Amino acid sequence: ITEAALVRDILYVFQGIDGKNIKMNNTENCYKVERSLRDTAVRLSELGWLHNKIRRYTDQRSLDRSFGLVGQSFCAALHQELREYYRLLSVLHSQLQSLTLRRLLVWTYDPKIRLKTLAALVDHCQGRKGGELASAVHAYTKTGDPYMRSLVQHILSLVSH
Amino acid sequence: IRRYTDQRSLDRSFGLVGQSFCAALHQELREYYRLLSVLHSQLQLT
Amino acid sequence: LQQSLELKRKMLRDKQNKKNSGQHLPIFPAWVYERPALIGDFTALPIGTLPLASQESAVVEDLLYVLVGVDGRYVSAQPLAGRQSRTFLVDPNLDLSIRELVHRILPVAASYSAVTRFIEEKSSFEYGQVNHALAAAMRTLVKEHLILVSQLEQLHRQGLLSLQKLWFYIQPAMRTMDILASLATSVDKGECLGGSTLSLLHDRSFSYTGDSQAQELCLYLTKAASAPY
Amino acid sequence: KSPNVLLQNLCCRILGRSEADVAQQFQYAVRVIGSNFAPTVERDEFLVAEKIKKELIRQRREADAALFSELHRKLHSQGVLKNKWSILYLLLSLSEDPRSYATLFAQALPRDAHST
Amino acid sequence: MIHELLLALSGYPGSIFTWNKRSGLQVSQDFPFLHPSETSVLNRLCRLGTDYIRFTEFIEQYTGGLHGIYLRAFCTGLDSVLQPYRQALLDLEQEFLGDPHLSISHVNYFLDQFQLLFPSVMVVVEQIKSQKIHGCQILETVYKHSCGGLPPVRSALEKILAVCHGVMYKQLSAWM
Amino acid sequence: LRVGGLGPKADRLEELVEELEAVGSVLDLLVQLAGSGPPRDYFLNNKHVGRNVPYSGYDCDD
Amino acid sequence: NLAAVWDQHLYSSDPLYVPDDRVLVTETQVIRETLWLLSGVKKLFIFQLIDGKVTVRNNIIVTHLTHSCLRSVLEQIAAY
Amino acid sequence: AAAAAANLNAVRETMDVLLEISRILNTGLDMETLSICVRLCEQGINPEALSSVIKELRKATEALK
């Protein structure tokens, strides 16, 4: 096994899909592998677990018209604000034929702090609908840091419409 | 100089000048580790 | 370690009785606190026979792990991550002159853990807007520590970096993590939150009227954490 | 060609003028590029890419900060430019906000730590 | 294998890209010439590609029961609003010819504008085909799905709404 | 010259001929023949002497 | 190369496979041929006639496409 | 030989990729001047130096207007 191998898999597991040596434990607890390499791989793969959880939700609560206009228009934002995360992850699929950057700890950091927020705004919104879901999305615009507070103030303009 | 700049930042009673003087006195140790690294670099010197 | 679950319990009830004039504060899902998420640290060769030059050359990559919170191969972080600061387990058969240099560097790693943990905790809604804004400006500077510990690996792969070079290069970083981890642990002991942390930052923005490098930190962190208030 | 005549041609492009008249400016340039010629700073590229993404994002031009990430891939794909760093650094240093701490952040490692 | 991905996100069946009328397009082999993670991306691309294939079969079936004038009008509407798919898959040649290094992950930054659109609009002809709907009653289900959240789908079925309303406006222009 | 070392010599050259403003063809001899020729100080680079020497810290290349 | 698809189909030799015998053709030659067939001409080398039905030409191939994908785009143009 | 075309094209491309990077940065450089500057930088030179001089020579040029 080599450090060059592990960074191949680590490009697919940022996209929810499995890899040649990274796999899964049982399902949606964690991304357990198969040294110190392993530990930095694990710590990166916790961006995959945050992708599945936000992908599935927009794949189901769109294609369910019962979930209403808000609900759909939310799942549109969680698709747009995730297509731009595939834009990033395309350049990292290129740039093979070095790349490691502590096996990417400084590339992924800025969006993993945006893959959080949304995965918690999903679980805070779960079960609501209608203009009540335009309230859970207004619960999180009351926080200090203009990353989360501006990311969530965009969704509270899509979901306002 | 370490047993001075150590023991006199643990002393939170030491004056404002006391820290300023002490801050200078280990800026002067960056110069000293910079040089000391140059000396390690040559070791492949007597 | 565990008691933060209880502190958040006391806190959120208190934010409710302050907001008896209202309702429906946000809160994070439990997985945000249960998962290892953004936390720091968690068959190798006969290093006693591995000769002195290569013995340094093996140890210097572990520091490049341990400076971001990864258990190295030698020099690996301890359990009881609790209390307020880490300790580490550099081996009994590593050369004594190297061990006494390793113990001189680690106080930036011991102080990287215990800043990630203030970036995590003091971001959730139990803690007001000001502890968020502080714990986010502090989140920014921890990226630049990740840029830097990446540069040092690039020089290492070229065979071009060694422990007396490493101890030159980390020095402005080792300073900032002391300033941050102190200004973090001071907010836990002096547990009070917004309006009071906005004092604590400004008080140290006088205490460092000399040092200038650490004086721009405290004007940065205060001018950032000021904005909500 | 050779650096001196290239540097003269540079002067003759930024100045709106002919070669003999600008020789005091070329004298100033010869005094300034001269001596400041070896690499002052240890040069690598993960940093000089970040130091520009950060500036575009600061300007709220966040899409250009992802366009750069692929323009840089293309510039690196072709195998011509062997000293990429300098021309990125130069363009960074010349950049302007279309509309100050600077010392807390990651910076270039100082190279004085080694000898030759 | 990047031109066959591109002809089988266009129509035509091939050999990498196996087809079946039930399963749709279905790369399924154990290729030694790809990183093993690959084929599940292709089955995801085959998804939209099959919501062109089976979404195209309906189109050539038209232009009596189902073979009504308003179904032709909606279905030649589902040509006008479907042409952006055809064109947006000529333009996907012009990169990959040039840049030797682009991997199929680029194609998903590109086409996932349509991943909100095709399987949603797929329920309107699957409904018209699973029920039966005739005459100006086509000009209702169109509008009742137009009242959606998603702004892509909410302007796919507003262009088909106005081109099939073109028929109603004329039949009700003879008549008056 | 100024890139090879020997910077003050290069400085001397230009100051020693800004003075001919009050011989262009004569200078054109020396430059076109410049390569041809045939193949110490204590105050030089010495911090311990002179008056108001500013702070510097170790040169080691000097 | 990338533009060499299924010319390293040759993993087919790891199970059991007999070589096809096939003729490479530049796609612009195929395009010349259809522009003739569709300008209403006769007896192209591609688009061979069998019985007044126009037909593909069998074992005719390129690189970026395989053998049976090409066959299927010819069928559609031959029926036109 | 054909290698005098194949490499010249790589220069035509690397030059206009860079013409993009330099316009997203809103710098003042025309196509020619950028080509002088990268010709310099490929020889080995310290970019801090000429980057300061380019602004100084600009200052002189505009201040006379």
Side-chain angles (χ1 to χ4, degrees), chain A, chain B, chain C residues 1-103 105-229, chain D, chain E residues 1-61 63-71 73-176, chain F, chain G residues 1-31 33-56 58-80, chain H:
Chain A
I1 306 97
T2 71
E3 31 198 343
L6 268 57
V7 65
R8 304 329 199 201
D9 311 30
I10 287 293
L11 293 169
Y12 300 111
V13 308
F14 297 0
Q15 194 253 333
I17 47 189
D18 196 338
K20 185 179 174 180
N21 282 313
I22 296 189
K23 302 186 183 178
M24 198 76 165
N25 183 204
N26 52 48
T27 280
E28 289 187 21
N29 68 333
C30 75
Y31 254 113
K32 166 169 157 60
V33 188
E34 299 182 39
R35 333 302 162 269
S36 80
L37 289 163
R38 183 175 68 206
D39 303 290
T40 182
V42 171
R43 178 175 169 178
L44 286 157
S45 76
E46 306 296 354
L47 187 57
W49 182 101
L50 291 169
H51 173 259
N52 291 342
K53 164 174 277 284
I54 188 170
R55 188 67 239 170
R56 298 194 209 291
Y57 171 89
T58 183
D59 282 3
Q60 306 313 315
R61 294 300 193 288
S62 182
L63 294 199
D64 182 13
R65 296 197 71 214
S66 75
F67 199 64
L69 296 194
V70 178
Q72 289 193 329
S73 309
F74 175 59
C75 290
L78 309 196
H79 183 79
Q80 174 169 285
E81 311 275 338
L82 189 149
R83 192 169 76 105
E84 296 187 350
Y85 166 90
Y86 297 137
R87 185 178 190 168
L88 153 68
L89 189 53
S90 78
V91 308
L92 280 53
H93 268 101
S94 46
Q95 294 195 344
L96 271 56
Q97 178 161 5
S98 299
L99 179 72
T100 183
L101 285 101
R102 297 268 71 221
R103 327 221 87 68
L104 307 140
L105 257 48
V106 57
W107 264 110
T108 63
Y109 183 100
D110 209 35
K112 177 171 176 187
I113 269 53
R114 151 172 292 248
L115 246 95
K116 288 188 74 168
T117 303
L118 302 184
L121 179 49
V122 163
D123 284 341
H124 174 62
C125 287
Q126 183 282 333
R128 298 95 183 286
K129 52 161 281 186
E132 178 178 54
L133 175 56
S135 82
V137 158
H138 194 72
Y140 282 32
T141 187
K142 296 189 298 177
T143 183
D145 54 296
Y147 206 71
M148 169 181 312
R149 170 170 161 187
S150 199
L151 179 172
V152 173
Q153 193 272 348
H154 192 54
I155 298 184
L156 191 162
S157 185
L158 301 184
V159 173
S160 179
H161 191 60
Chain B
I1 311 161
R2 284 196 73 76
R3 292 198 285 95
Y4 178 89
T5 201
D6 284 3
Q7 296 185 354
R8 304 206 63 65
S9 297
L10 297 178
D11 183 6
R12 290 139 290 125
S13 83
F14 197 25
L16 198 72
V17 164
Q19 295 306 329
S20 175
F21 166 69
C22 198
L25 181 58
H26 60 176
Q27 153 175 275
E28 303 306 334
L29 299 179
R30 294 187 197 156
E31 301 316 313
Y32 185 58
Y33 306 124
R34 168 141 67 64
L35 178 138
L36 182 52
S37 75
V38 176
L39 318 188
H40 195 282
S41 165
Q42 322 305 46
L43 183 46
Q44 285 303 341
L45 174 122
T46 189
Chain C
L1 185 155
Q2 297 80 6
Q3 76 273 17
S4 297
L5 276 292
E6 294 93 319
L7 265 60
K8 285 178 293 190
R9 218 58 43 217
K10 290 167 271 317
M11 284 267 181
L12 190 57
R13 167 69 270 203
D14 296 347
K15 299 313 178 292
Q16 209 72 258
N17 86 326
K18 168 59 195 295
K19 195 81 151 176
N20 279 343
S21 58
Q23 55 274 70
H24 311 316
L25 274 296
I27 179 62
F28 291 157
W31 67 254
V32 179
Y33 308 115
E34 175 55 60
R35 223 161 169 91
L38 270 300
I39 295 178
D41 317 97
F42 300 136
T43 54
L45 297 76
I47 190 155
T49 301
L50 185 73
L52 303 177
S54 71
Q55 195 180 122
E56 160 172 14
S57 190
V59 164
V60 65
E61 43 181 41
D62 291 8
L63 280 305
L64 296 173
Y65 284 112
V66 172
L67 264 78
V68 300
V70 170
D71 302 352
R73 189 189 302 265
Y74 307 98
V75 65
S76 60
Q78 285 290 52
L80 263 74
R83 305 80 63 91
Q84 277 300 288
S85 284
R86 195 63 68 151
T87 65
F88 300 79
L89 185 48
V90 66
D91 303 64
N93 61 355
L94 187 72
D95 186 41
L96 301 180
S97 197
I98 301 179
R99 310 215 308 155
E100 289 296 317
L101 178 52
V102 170
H103 286 297
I105 292 161
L106 293 182
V108 72
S111 184
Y112 183 53
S113 169
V115 180
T116 53
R117 303 195 302 203
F118 182 101
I119 292 156
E120 289 199 330
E121 290 189 333
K122 304 317 190 298
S123 72
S124 69
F125 313 90
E126 296 95 328
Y127 302 104
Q129 307 175 111
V130 176
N131 275 37
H132 306 163
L134 168 62
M138 195 162 311
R139 188 186 70 209
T140 291
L141 305 182
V142 166
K143 183 172 176 182
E144 272 64 29
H145 182 102
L146 296 175
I147 292 176
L148 194 149
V149 68
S150 303
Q151 301 196 60
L152 303 171
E153 183 165 37
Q154 175 156 17
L155 306 187
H156 179 224
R157 282 191 294 123
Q158 305 176 8
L160 181 145
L161 175 140
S162 57
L163 288 171
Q164 263 83 5
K165 304 180 73 175
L166 182 50
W167 192 16
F168 176 27
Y169 292 124
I170 71 190
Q171 296 270 109
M174 174 177 317
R175 187 54 171 162
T176 293
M177 304 330 283
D178 286 357
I179 318 305
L180 295 178
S182 305
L183 197 41
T185 285
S186 181
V187 175
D188 282 6
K189 291 189 192 174
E191 206 158 87
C192 202
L193 45 68
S196 88
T197 54
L198 182 32
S199 305
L200 174 59
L201 307 173
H202 178 83
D203 293 4
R204 295 197 192 211
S205 191
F206 275 123
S207 177
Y208 297 127
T209 297
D211 194 23
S212 191
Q213 188 275 349
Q215 199 266 19
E216 283 298 338
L217 280 177
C218 302
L219 192 145
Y220 176 54
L221 299 177
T222 307
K223 197 164 185 179
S226 157
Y229 213 107
Chain D
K1 277 212 260 193
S2 37
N4 44 21
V5 60
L6 298 188
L7 198 172
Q8 186 177 340
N9 287 359
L10 197 172
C11 302
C12 303
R13 280 221 62 76
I14 37 154
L15 297 153
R17 290 181 182 95
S18 38
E19 306 60 10
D21 319 73
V22 301
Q24 71 288 65
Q25 312 296 43
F26 184 8
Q27 154 69 358
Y28 167 76
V30 164
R31 314 203 275 102
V32 175
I33 288 85
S35 77
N36 294 105
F37 194 94
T40 51
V41 293
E42 191 58 81
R43 72 101 186 82
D44 61 26
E45 35 204 91
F46 299 165
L47 175 67
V48 83
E50 275 320 346
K51 308 233 278 279
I52 178 177
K53 290 175 180 173
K54 194 190 314 300
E55 174 56 21
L56 289 168
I57 293 174
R58 186 197 69 72
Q59 295 173 19
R60 324 157 296 282
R61 297 196 292 130
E62 191 294 341
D64 297 337
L67 185 59
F68 175 83
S69 310
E70 329 158 305
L71 295 175
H72 179 283
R73 192 279 306 168
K74 290 192 296 183
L75 199 80
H76 189 185
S77 152
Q78 297 171 22
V80 164
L81 271 192
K82 306 310 300 285
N83 195 311
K84 281 170 282 276
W85 166 83
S86 301
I87 182 57
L88 289 173
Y89 193 117
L90 172 58
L91 286 171
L92 163 61
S93 186
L94 287 162
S95 63
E96 172 205 358
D97 186 345
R99 206 288 306 273
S100 302
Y101 312 91
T103 313
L104 322 180
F105 304 122
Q107 283 290 9
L109 298 185
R111 170 61 78 90
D112 297 344
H114 200 73
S115 178
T116 57
Chain E
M1 59 159 65
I2 325 297
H3 217 193
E4 280 197 28
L5 171 64
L6 263 192
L7 268 194
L9 296 205
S10 203
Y12 330 128
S15 197
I16 299 300
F17 288 81
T18 71
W19 167 267
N20 181 295
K21 140 44 75 184
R22 148 204 50 249
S23 307
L25 306 162
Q26 58 151 56
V27 47
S28 191
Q29 310 90 326
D30 298 335
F31 293 133
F33 80 105
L34 305 175
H35 191 252
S37 167
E38 255 312 6
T39 65
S40 302
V41 192
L42 297 176
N43 281 265
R44 179 173 192 266
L45 287 154
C46 282
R47 182 185 294 176
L48 198 90
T50 297
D51 292 346
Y52 182 83
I53 294 170
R54 78 178 76 252
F55 198 88
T56 283
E57 289 195 333
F58 177 94
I59 314 175
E60 70 167 37
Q61 176 166 95
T63 188
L66 294 176
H67 201 293
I69 187 165
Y70 284 99
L71 192 141
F74 168 95
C75 185
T76 55
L78 200 69
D79 200 6
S80 176
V81 283
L82 202 40
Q83 183 57 14
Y85 180 86
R86 307 203 187 106
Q87 176 263 110
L89 185 139
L90 315 194
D91 173 337
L92 277 190
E93 194 65 0
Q94 285 187 0
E95 323 301 31
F96 280 69
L97 295 162
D99 299 50
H101 291 123
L102 287 170
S103 186
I104 48 186
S105 309
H106 183 246
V107 151
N108 75 26
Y109 170 63
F110 220 61
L111 273 177
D112 271 7
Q113 177 176 6
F114 282 99
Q115 195 89 234
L116 281 177
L117 191 150
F118 258 22
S120 176
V121 178
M122 179 64 194
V123 290
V124 176
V125 292
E126 183 56 24
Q127 180 217 66
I128 289 162
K129 187 177 175 181
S130 180
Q131 303 185 0
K132 287 88 184 179
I133 302 183
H134 290 162
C136 295
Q137 201 71 348
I138 293 288
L139 278 60
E140 179 170 300
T141 192
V142 175
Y143 183 96
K144 296 197 308 198
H145 282 271
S146 192
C147 302
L150 308 180
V153 177
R154 184 155 168 181
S155 209
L157 310 93
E158 182 158 277
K159 290 192 298 184
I160 292 181
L161 186 135
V163 72
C164 72
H165 278 226
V167 182
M168 178 276 287
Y169 272 124
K170 261 180 61 212
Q171 287 185 354
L172 313 184
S173 169
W175 181 265
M176 293 81 103
Chain F
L1 286 166
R2 208 186 305 249
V3 308
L6 55 85
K9 191 188 308 324
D11 167 35
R12 190 167 33 223
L13 186 164
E14 53 79 15
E15 60 100 10
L16 191 54
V17 302
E18 146 46 12
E19 60 96 22
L20 295 309
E21 86 294 325
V23 301
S25 185
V26 197
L27 285 161
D28 266 329
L29 254 294
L30 307 177
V31 298
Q32 288 172 125
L33 297 177
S36 53
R40 61 173 163 66
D41 194 350
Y42 281 115
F43 266 18
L44 178 55
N45 46 8
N46 186 351
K47 300 301 184 185
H48 311 299
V49 298
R51 194 185 297 202
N52 297 322
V53 299
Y55 180 100
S56 72
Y58 316 108
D59 295 301
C60 197
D61 52 348
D62 292 353
Chain G
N1 283 239
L2 175 42
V5 198
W6 201 263
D7 306 347
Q8 64 298 30
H9 69 295
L10 68 81
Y11 78 85
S12 300
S13 72
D14 304 317
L16 274 72
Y17 170 76
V18 86
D20 304 284
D21 181 13
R22 292 187 169 140
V23 66
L24 270 71
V25 59
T26 82
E27 82 306 349
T28 52
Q29 295 167 256
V30 163
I31 299 164
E33 305 269 82
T34 120
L35 280 32
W36 279 315
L37 174 65
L38 301 172
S39 54
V41 176
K42 317 181 195 285
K43 69 179 305 296
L44 298 150
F45 157 69
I46 290 142
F47 303 109
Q48 77 188 354
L49 280 285
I50 298 294
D51 63 47
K53 275 312 307 163
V54 188
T55 303
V56 288
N58 205 329
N59 265 311
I60 182 167
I61 188 164
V62 191
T63 53
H64 51 335
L65 287 320
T66 51
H67 167 34
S68 304
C69 182
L70 281 183
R71 194 190 69 186
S72 304
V73 55
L74 291 181
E75 289 289 1
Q76 209 276 355
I77 300 160
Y80 256 108
Chain H
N7 292 295
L8 171 58
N9 189 67
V11 171
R12 198 23 182 151
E13 255 147 42
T14 287
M15 200 58 29
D16 40 349
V17 170
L18 281 152
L19 185 66
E20 201 60 0
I21 298 184
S22 58
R23 71 148 287 276
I24 71 169
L25 286 171
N26 180 49
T27 68
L29 274 55
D30 63 27
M31 162 45 68
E32 311 80 340
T33 309
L34 180 64
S35 183
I36 303 170
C37 297
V38 67
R39 270 189 289 173
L40 285 164
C41 292
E42 185 65 18
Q43 289 279 47
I45 167 162
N46 199 63
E48 306 176 303
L50 61 169
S51 56
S52 72
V53 172
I54 287 159
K55 291 182 289 187
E56 161 155 344
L57 296 174
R58 293 161 100 170
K59 187 195 307 290
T61 303
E62 281 296 93
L64 291 172
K65 303 185 184 190

